[PDB]
């Protein structure tokens, strides 16, 4: 699956979306630099409206997961 397609479900817990996201990104055939860029660019962008609202308002992965 392309990492671009991993999007948080409307009722999916943020931790579960994070898990799916990292699993898919680990499976992508890409350099570590490209994978890092994808985490900074897609993780908040592909979150559902509720979590996007909280995340934008703030950042580490551990701060993101607590805020949601």
């Amino acid at each position: 699956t392309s990492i671009l397609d991993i999007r948080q479900g409307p009722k999916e817990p943020f931790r579960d979306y994070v898990d799916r996201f990292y699993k898919t990104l680990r499976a992508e055939q890409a350099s570590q630099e490209v994978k890092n860029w994808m985490t900074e660019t897609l993780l908040v962008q592909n979150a559902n409206p509720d979590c996007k609202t909280i995340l934008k308002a703030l950042a580490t992965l551990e701060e993101m997961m607590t805020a949601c």
């Epitope: 392309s2 671009l4 397609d5 860029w37 660019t41 897609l42 962008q45 592909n46």
Partner: nanobody, 113 residues
Framework: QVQLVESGGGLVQAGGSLRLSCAAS????????MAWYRQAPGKARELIAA????????VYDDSVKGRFTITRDDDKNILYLQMNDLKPEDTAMYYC??????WGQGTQVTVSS
């Protein structure tokens, strides 16, 4: 399945250039992040370049740095991959991708010598 459509592939000698285009006329497809992938027969489809709208940040695989440039034209809704200084190792099918798009048929790049 908004399906993206790649074009601009061709047959060129090593050192030459190409420009791939990706579009879906009549479709609402440009996502905040877009990427180009490439796949040689029987090999993993690899993520080689990506761009993010707004700040226009870009990232590239080490094998294409300083040779390829990903750009997007927001008015025309076209994503491009400029390819300079081509190498036989660049020979592959190239695919573009947006968040939620279906995979296109790709465009073939063949580099001789």
């Amino acid at each position: 399945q908004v399906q993206l459509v790649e074009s601009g592939g061709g047959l060129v000698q090593a050192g030459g250039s190409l420009r791939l285009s990706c579009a879906a006329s009549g479709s609402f497809f440009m996502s905040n992040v877009m990427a180009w992938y490439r796949q040689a027969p029987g090999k993993a489809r690899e993520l080689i370049a990506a761009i993010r709208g707004g700040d226009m940040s870009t990232v590239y695989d080490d094998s294409v740095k300083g040779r390829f440039t990903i750009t997007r034209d927001d008015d025309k809704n076209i994503l491009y991959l400029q390819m300079n200084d081509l190498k036989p190792e660049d020979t592959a099918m190239y695919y573009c991708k947006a968040s939620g798009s279906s995979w296109g048929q790709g465009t073939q790049v063949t580099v001789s010598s």
